[PDB]
Structure formats: C-alpha cells, structure tokens
Design a protein around this ligand. Structure first.
Ligand SMILES: [Mg+2]
Ligand SMILES: [Mg+2]
Ligand SMILES: [Mg+2]
Ligand SMILES: [Mg+2]
Lengths: 296, 296, 296, 296
C-alpha cells in the first residue's frame, strides 16, 4: 500500500479578527518543515475543523499543499464527517486540492454500528486513489472503530493503510498489530507516543509538535531507527507538556502555548471554543518554562 | 418564561429511494397529533439530523410547522451544531420557518469548556425570541453541560427555559431541580420517563412515542396530573420496548419497528447508519408483539 | 416474605483511644430510635466493618439488638464477605446474636461471575431463617449483581426479599421493579432517596440519617404514604448535605459531621481511613450550618 | 533499594476435595523454576487469597519458600488487606515464614483517600525489613494509588521499591517512570507485558505464566536485554491466550486452562468463584491449542 507515516503535526489554525490568518498559517507550516516533520495534517481536530467553513477547509489545505511543494513533507488532509455523503465529498475535494492522503475521523454523534462504520469507510476509500488513514477518538465521537473493523477495512480497501489511535488503550494497539502487523498504527496521543512506536507504530499525529516540532520529530525518528533509549528519553522529558496541553480541551492549551511563545499573534478561537481559565493559562505558562521552544 | 412541555416526539425521518419521504413524514406527524402528543421535534438525533442536507433540514421543519397549524401541537425544531455560528443560523432559520421553539444539542466532538458552552448558548438564545431547550447527551457529544452552567443559562437568558436530559443520571436531575425549581426538565431517556417526571420534570422528548404515541402521551399526562400510580404502570409496561429500542444506536431500532409495524414503506437509513443485524431485527419484532400499535 | 423496610440507618462506629466506644454506640442508637428510624444497620460499610475484628462485630450487633428491644426498631446486621464460607458464618453469627435480618454486601475484590454470585447468596440464605437483603455497590466491590441475578435470588430463595442499591442507576431501579414488583428495593444512595422511593422502593439505608435521622425518617414516611410533594421537598433540601457527605469516601465525612455536631467525642478512624483534609473539614462544617441537627 | 524483579508468576492455588493440594502446589512451583521464572507470588489475587484461611496462607508461603530454596527464584508473598492492622500482621507473618518480599494490594472496598493509602503502606513498610511492592488494581479495589502517592512512598519508605500495575493505563506507566525512573514498575496485566517493559518496566507478575512459564519468562528476559523485537514477538503471539484468560474473572480461566492441560487434578474453586460457563470453557480450550504447553 501507499502509506504516509513518520512525524506529523495536527496543525492549529490561527485566527485574526475572526478570519483564518493565512500568512501565519503558512509561516507555521514552514516552521514544521524546518524542524524535521514528515507530514502535516491541516484541518484536523487540533485545527478546529468543526468551526471552519468549507471554503476555509479548502484554503487551509491549499496553503499546506503549496507550502510543502519542493519538500519531502506530505499533506495528510483532515476530511472526516458524521455523514458518509459529506465525507466522500470532502475526501474527493482534498484529492482535488493536491493532498497526499486523507485523515478521516470516525463519525461523531450519530454512533454508527460496526457494519455502518465499515460501509462508511469503504465508500470514502473507493472515492479517491490516495491513502486513507482511519482516526479513532471515542472520547470525542462517542463511538469506537473495533479492531476487527479496522483490520477488515485494511484488508478489503486498497487505500486504507492504518489508523490514528487516540483512545488511551495500549491493549488495543497490541491487538491491532498482533493480528495485522502490516498496518500503520499512528499515535494520536502525545503522552504515549513512545509506547505506541515501540510496539511497532510507525508515526505520530501530534498536538505537542505544534510547539516543539524538533523534539517530536526527533522522538519519532529515533524510534523508527530502533534507538528506543533516545526515543523514550524525549518521551519522558515531554510528559509534563504533553499532559498540560490537555488541561482543557485541545486545542485550547496548544493555542494558548503558541500565543505565550510568540508563535501566533492573538489568543483567538471560534466559539464554542474560547480562552482557558486564568488558572490554566498560568499552569500552561509554568510548564513551558522547562522547554526550549524553536522560533521561526 | 415561554415554555414547550408535555409529551413530545423526536420524529424519525423516513426515506424513500434515498430522499426524504415528504408524504410519509406529514402522515406520521398527523398520527402523533391524533394520539395526544403535545409537541413534535423535527430533525433531532432520532430524525438523523447529521445526514440531512440544509435543504432537507428546512423541508422537514416546514412540513412539521404546516402539519401542526390549527392544532395545539407545538414544533420544537432541532437546531444544534458544534459550531456556534452555525447553531445561531439554524436557530434563526427555524424561527423564520415558523417553529415554536428550538432544541439545541450541546456541541458534539469539539468538547467545549463550560465557559464555551455558556457563550455558545448565550449567542443562540440572543439570536431569536422563541423558547430554547438545552439538550445534554454526553454519550453522543463527548461533553456534559454541568448543572451550574444549565442554571446560569436559565437565569441569564430569557428564552432558555430548560434542558432535555439524556444522561442516565437521576442524581443530576435532583441537583437541577433542587437548586433551580423553575426550569423545565425534560426526559430524553424513555426508560426513565416516570422517575424524571415524578421528580418535577414537565415533559418527555421520546423515541418510543414514534411507535406508541398514545402510551407515552398517557404516561406524561397521568404524571403531570400527579396520577403517579397510573404513570408508573405505563412506564413499567413500556420498559421492554424502551430498552429494545436501543439494542443498536437510535434511530436504527425505532425505524426498524416503524417499518415492521407498517408505518413506513422502506427500511432506509443514510450512511453511516444502516439496517440492524438479523438477530436484533428479530428481537425488536418479538418485543413489539407485547404492545398495541396504533395505525393511521 | 418476611421483610425489613422503612427508614434505616447505616450506623457509624465511634472509636475512643482505638477501641469501639460502646457507650457512645448505644447512645447513638437510642437517638436514632427516638427520631423515627425503623431499623438500624450495625457494621455496614458506614460502620467500618472492614477494619473491625470479629469480636467487635459481635459487640456492635449485640449492642444494637439490646438497645432495640422493646421497640418496633429492627436490627439489620451487616454480614457480608468476599468469601462465601465466611459470609455464611457471619450470617449465622448475626442470627444467633438476635439480629432481625442481615445485609450482605456483594463479594468485593475477587469479582465473582453472576453464577458465583447466585451460589454465594443461595448459600447465605439457606444458612439462616431470617430475612436477607442483598447489597449492590459496584463502586466499592468491583462487581455488579445484575437485575436478572437479583430477581432469580428473590424468586428462588425464601428469605431473600430485596436489594440495597448504591449504583446511581435509576434505569436499573425501573428494570428491577417492572419485572419483579414484589421485591423491596432499598435506596443506598441518599441524594436519590426520593426518586427510588417514588418508583416503588420501600425504604432507605441512609448515611445522612446518622446526622439528620428525623429528616430522613420523615422523607421516607411521606414517600411511603405517596405524599410525594412533601418527600421531594425534604429530598431537595437534603441534597447539599447528601452530596458533601461524600466529598471524601464514606464514612470520613459523616464521622466528621458527627464530631462537629458534638454527637461523638473523638474524630477517630481505623487505618486506612483517616481524617479529611482541612479544606473538606471546613466544607462539611459550612454545609452543616444550614440544617437543624437533633441532639440526644 | 533491595528489589525483586524479572519474570514472576501469580501462582494458582489448586484444591483437592476442598483442601489445598499441597503436593500439586509444590509440583507446579518446581515447574515454574524449570522454565526460567525469576520469582513466584503465592496467595495473590490469582491464588484466591480472599477465600484461603490464615493457616492456608502460611502453608502456601512455606511450600513456595521451601521449593525455591537452593535456587535463585525468589518468593514475593501476597500480604495485603483492606485493614491496616491486618496488613501489618500479614507482612510480618510472610517475613517470619521466609518470604523474600511482599506484594501488598491497595485496600479494597473501603476506598481510602490518598493520605490514607500513604499511612497504610507506611505502616506496612515499617513493620518488616524486606522489600515491599505496591499493587494497584482499581478495577478490583475501587481505589487508585495515584502516581504522586506511589512516588512519595517510594522516596519516603526504604522497603517500598515499586508497584505492580493492573490498570490498563500506559499513560500512568509513562508518568511513573518519567518522574521517578528509579522505581521498579511491574506489569500486572499480561496482554501489555511488552509495552510496560519497553518503557522501562523491570518485570511482570503474570497470570499466563501459570500455563506458559517459558514464554512469559523469555518475553521478560528478551525485553530486559533490550531485544525488543523478540519480546514483542512473544507478546503478540500470546495476545489471544492473554485475553481469553480474562473472559471470566481471573483466576477462573487460568484454573480452567491448567485443568484442561492436565496440570491440576480437579477444576475446583472456593465460592464465590466457580467453574466458567460451558461456552467460555470451550473458548478457553480452543485458544489453548495454538500454544505449546510445557509439562512437569
Ligand atoms: Mg477481510
Ligand atoms: Mg401552533
Ligand atoms: Mg423520553
Ligand atoms: Mg387531567
């Protein structure tokens, strides 16, 4: 299969006066490229995909594609939906705009059955000829793509090559790779990047890498080179920031951290997301003190 | 406050050849009206709001408004979204399409903080001058509107008049009405309709009432008259069907039952929803035999 | 069946210099009797049964039996264990010491299957000729007596007459009484005493009644007479104290409250239980100021 | 600190006509020694400690100590209790009976606070001069030893050297070893033995090793020698048996497998534990056929 693996960043989407700051966005993607990232994920969960318009979705993908031109860095575009017809259209659109692959979140809110999830992803995979990464985050969606459904999709659909797991369940990661060792398991939970990689995971889609792209890329590349000692050392050092970046719902902490570090101009979200509490604002600032944050 | 309470039905959305069956939809609402229902909820969770287009959202609301004209039955239109700007637009559309009130689900997937939830609903409430009922279903959304946030919204916003609770948490129902006895607590979980009403709840938004509107109507009106003995009797008799209607994710079982009862032509869903398993199809059919299902 | 229902108190066990304060214990029981309580539960969870010796178990049961003599008040002795051979011995023990019935918690820690739970309680019930109340508290035991297992035990074992439910699950309470309306469902969760009673529950085994026995007794008798308005009023008024009495693991808050009220001489627990933090000590003290606490 | 690490077995306790089969117990331990195990754990959870008498506790510890004498295999005796005074006595008795260290489960059922857990284990640690391993299994105890409490106990008490984790929470494993890399984190959940070891865990206390001691000891020794490829291979191969051994509550499946393998004479438990369902009996038998089971 064609795959998209390695160190990847779920890009935040900076706002300026309520609009997407397109210049800041490209600047941030170039900063990821210059710090060893292998792929960028525009308009994922961390990018506030839920509150962007379809045109903003396209703008972010196009900027990502344009900024990665002439580099090895791939664009794995977020294109999920709770409606299969919309997810198919979003997958096709992302392919139009030049994306290298698709990240497709499991349907949220409507809690489809495993049979429904299979038909959902089959339709998406059959609509394009680029790689498709499943995305399991039951804490957000209210549903879980079971191991059996993931493996069936991997084996039955040419484009589907793995899953981004954000479920806090290392047992499921063992289950997945013990029964289907050919799939690409991608960590969607920064604090446990190293345990997923050390079990045969092949990449991360990281929130923390927005702030510390050099450290996350180094961790991932050490692990991929089977230098497990050095990968674990970075994972252990990153634990404090990895956890504080979820003291409130992502991406509220990571955007707060990017603002405190001077990497974005304004601490601006789109409702229903908003600024953190003053206490959590201060807690994030404290945790950042121990880390060296790359500039532009 | 202006309120919409009593026995209410979360209307299923019948499909025919991939399209909303507009004739069937009106016929089902008329059947609800003729069996003692006090309000209907077009395009809620049970109505597959996630997979309908904006045009189909508009059409279902318009059919409900037109069908309820000249009756006492109110239209409480589903108008929630995980994007505040989108929820505001849907609320304004429902008011302009003639809805009597709004049912607004808590933002799904992006997990806003309580502060974000407050600002989200404040913006919705200020955009219209019709009643707004909050809707808490953390099993589907991944977030919980806290009692403090519900009570703050009730006291701060004139049009927010209560909450549809679908959280299986009777402790919270006590918490809500002990600290704010003026709000309208509405049961969003059929199996525990009677316990919520007996604690001072003033209505239900029911899945079961699609199939058994006369029984749910009788249950609610018995309870509202403090005939708790007769209300509990109906709630107990309904437990088996109330539970089997969630053997798979709602609305898969209720649509299956409506099809088995001859109330809809086609057992059609929009992906990622699909037909139940063969075993659950047979279990739903068996449980239905205990109950007298009104026709048209 | 022979039953023990009504307003019942899970008695705290006061300590003085590391030993059971036997005079205080008797005086506290008399105070419960004089404030309308229908039965007392020595050496339940609230009585720190886990850290008492078998000799101290006997002493508490004997004091309860002797103090209730010549009154209508029954003694429902705690007699559970995670070992069936030990639970049988404790049940026979309590019957021999003159207890009117036994409360037998589901086996903790070793997580028996439903079949094992059935055989466990069958063995206890066949060992005595006094009523047996099951006790489901999965948050403490790590296991759940299913509705099916409870109903089978009620129907198959003559002395098993109901269950004390401490699971926060009003759906299960509907399930239990809809399928077996002859059983005695007893609330083991103070905050939701009224909802359980209004669905046909026939008593409470209360923590709060240690502090406010007159209020819990009145709530229960209002509810048993279907004076739901009055019962709900008390339940709502009690919500704040009902919740603060679990700000730390019971019986740490209730013993703190009893000490603050002057009802026990020393705030002494047996390890691993200990004094609350200073912040929760102050929270309990503040909440108590809203309630009228009866003396001796 | 003095430590007990490596591949360890939570020994089942075979019964014959209701009594501990002492000859079988010795035979099974010698079998563990012959297949590379580094320590044995008599009368843990897997050993049905809850239903053994004090005299049976001593017999099992004495048989383990004598069978391991003159070998390098250590005896890590189960000595926990929900009562601190009892846990202190059990620790002293295990020491007197010749154990090399103690495994002390967190108090079950009574749910002590973190302050209470600290004082509980401090009292245990001060009562003996042999190593003490904490044991966190919240699914059984209803309480969790927090990372902060574990680390404080490790730093404040000379005998306390690590924790057996059975919580399915690899995030906590990173948390523990990132903040206190000197502690001995021991896997108490077979399915994730390799992920815990690859993050710096230093041993396992295994259920599966009762049946497959050679495979578990090799997995552990591969991992400790930093041969992660071979450790993961065994962990992946063992996943099916690792999961089926918990299709019902441990130790019901492992005793069933040991009986099916001919390693014990009778499939006898002490109530409330009992034989598995006929369906799970067959599933266990089917899974076992894929594995080479060492004899005596
Ligand atoms: Mg296949
Ligand atoms: Mg009207
Ligand atoms: Mg309802
Ligand atoms: Mg009337």
């Amino acid at each position: 299969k064609n795959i998209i693996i390695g160190a990847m960043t779920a890009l935040i989407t900076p706002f300026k006066n309520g609009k997407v700051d397109e210049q800041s966005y490209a600047r941030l993607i170039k900063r990821q490229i210059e710090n060893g990232i292998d792929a960028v994920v525009p308009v994922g969960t961390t990018g506030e995909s839920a509150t962007l318009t379809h045109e903003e979705h396209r703008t972010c993908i196009e900027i990502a594609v344009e900024t990665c031109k002439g580099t090895k860095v791939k664009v794995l575009a977020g294109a999920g939906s709770d409606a299969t017809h919309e997810a198919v259209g979003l997958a096709k659109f992302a392919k139009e705009h030049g994306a290298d692959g698709i990240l497709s979140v499991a349907p949220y809110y409507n809690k489809p059955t495993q049979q429904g999830l299979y038909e959902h992803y089959k339709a998406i995979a059959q609509s394009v000829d680029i790689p498709v990464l499943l995305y399991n985050v039951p804490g957000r969606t209210g549903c879980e793509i079971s191991t059996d459904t993931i493996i069936k999709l991997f084996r039955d659909c040419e484009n589907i090559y793995g899953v981004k797991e954000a479920s806090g369940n290392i047992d499921k990661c063992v289950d997945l790779l013990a029964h289907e060792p050919r799939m690409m398991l991608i960590s969607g939970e920064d604090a446990i990047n190293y345990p997923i990689l050390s079990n045969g995971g092949k990449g991360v889609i990281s929130v923390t890498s927005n702030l510390l792209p050099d450290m996350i890329s180094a961790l991932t590349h050490f692990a991929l080179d089977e230098n497990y000692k050095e990968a674990k050392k970075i994972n252990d050092e990153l634990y404090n920031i990895n956890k504080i970046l979820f003291c409130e719902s992502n991406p509220i902490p990571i955007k707060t951290a990017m603002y405190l570090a001077g990497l974005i101009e304004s601490l601006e979200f789109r409702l229903p997301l908003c600024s953190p509490s003053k206490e959590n604002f201060a807690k994030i600032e404290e945790v950042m003190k121990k880390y060296k944050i790359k500039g532009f």
